[PDB]
Structure formats: C-alpha cells, structure tokens
Design a protein around this ligand. Sequence first.
Ligand SMILES: Fc1cccc([C@H]2CCCN2c2ccc3ncc(-c4ccccn4)n3n2)c1
Length: 281
Amino acid sequence: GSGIRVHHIKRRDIVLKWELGEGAFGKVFLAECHNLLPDKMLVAVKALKERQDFQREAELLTMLQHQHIVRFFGVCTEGRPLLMVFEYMRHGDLNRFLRSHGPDAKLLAGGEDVAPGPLGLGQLLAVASQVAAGMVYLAGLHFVHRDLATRNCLVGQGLVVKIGDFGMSTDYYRTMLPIRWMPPESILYRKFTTESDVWSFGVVLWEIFTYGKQPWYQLSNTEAIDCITQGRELERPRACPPEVYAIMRGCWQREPQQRHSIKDVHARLQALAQAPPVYLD
Ligand SMILES: Fc1cccc([C@H]2CCCN2c2ccc3ncc(-c4ccccn4)n3n2)c1
C-alpha cells in the first residue's frame, strides 16, 4: 500500500555499545552505525520491547523533520527487536540536563561544550526559543503533542535543543495523563488542541526557569488538578525575568482562544534570546 518511504538499516550495520536510558519511551542504546552518512558514527537506538504501531510511528517520524526535531534516520526490522535509529544527543533529556545545571545540583556537570553550574539567562532563553521553534513546526502541520514537557526534549552538542519524543514517573496520573502540564479544557472536557500545547509550553517555560523542578511539586495529582481548574498559576521562578513570566502567563489563559499563538510566543522568546534583559534578585 501507499505511504511514506521509511529508510531501512541493515542490522550488521548497527553495533550496540550500551544502554543510555529506560522509561516510558522504552530502551535506548548508544550505538555505532555504518554506513549512514559518508563512514562510522554514533547514534541513539530505541529497541522496542514487544508491530502495527511501529510502522505508523516510523512513517510520522519520517515526515516530521525540522531543525528542532531530533533527527530520525530510519528503522531496522530484520529480526527482533525492532529498532528505531536517531542522531545521538550527547547531553540526554532536557529535564535531567536542567537539573544537572541547577543551583541545587549535587555534582559538577559537562561537557567541554557547556560550562558547569547555572546556565546564563541568554542560554535559558535559547533553550526555550528552540523548543518553541519545534512547536511552531508541529502546529503548522496540525500535529498535536499530548505530552510536551522537558523530559521529552533532548540536548545535543553546543546546547542545541530538540523535541525528542512525541508520546505516540510521578509526572503522570492514573491511561496516564501528564496532568501537571495539562490545560483546564483537557482536564475538564478531554479536549486537546494546538492551543492546549501553548499551555503546556508555558509549563515547559516554567520547568526551564526552575532548572527542571516539577510543576506543583508540593502537591498531589488531585491537588494540582484542583489548582489548574480553579485558575491558580505557577509562581514566577526566581531566575525568571518579569518579561519571561508575562509570556508564561499569556500561555495560561483559561480560554484557549485568548492564549497567544506558538508563533508569537517563539518570536518574543527569540527576541529576548538575542538581547537578554538584565536581571538579578
Ligand atoms: F526526548 C527523549 C527523552 C528520552 C528518550 C528519548 C528517546 C526515545 C525517542 C528517541 N530518543 C532519543 C533520541 C536520541 C537520543 N540521544 C540521546 C538520547 C538519550 C535518551 C535518554 C537518556 C539519555 N540519552 N536519545 N534519545 C527522547
């Protein structure tokens, strides 16, 4: 049948090195690949635990290509396990990267490409702008991401940041809803739209400027649901300038239609990134 051509990779061409991570996304390995882009190169490989969903995912991953979507190279389906092959993002998921650079961080981090310790305001803004740029692309295709959160973004060489997992853990509530990232219309009416992604992106913005804290971390899942549906908003992070907090708050309008577009949000973030406001205290 007709569909997107998905690149296939021979199995003897993939040499698994070791596991990088486990979780809701499956098992991810570091691997060498021959011959992807002409000689040998590191990639990330997702090995699937347990068939039909895989091909659909591979098709969609093939379609969704952007500077701020993690590069997908193709699949290996000759024998088990099924493999999906990605560019290797050397700094891992954005939530852990943020935490390792937070003030609270227990150890020093890096990396010859990024300084250890807290990120600059300009860098935090560059991280936010890049995730937004990714979201602009997806909204342009009417792709709705139902689990936008820093745990699903990846950080590569020199602080390039990309959306890393599409969602096709205490951050979830029993399906599993990333309830702390969800807008009122999702919780109340089970509606999720591109405007709902603007809300979630507002929460991502908060994650970034708290160096990866969990939204409403003091509260239970039902208590957080109470906050979200009663109109209580996450407080301004100490490292977050008032200009950036105004952007978050624009994302958190109760009425979806009064939230600013992701295009507008990205534009304001990128402007700040190019000229970061002075901010202390
Ligand atoms: F946005 C996420 C969050 C978590 C996992 C992924 C996985 C599943 C889909 C693709 N992917 C990738 C793709 C490339 C890559 N380079 C390094 C890593 C990685 C992953 C976990 C821990 C350390 N490193 N990854 N991970 C994406």
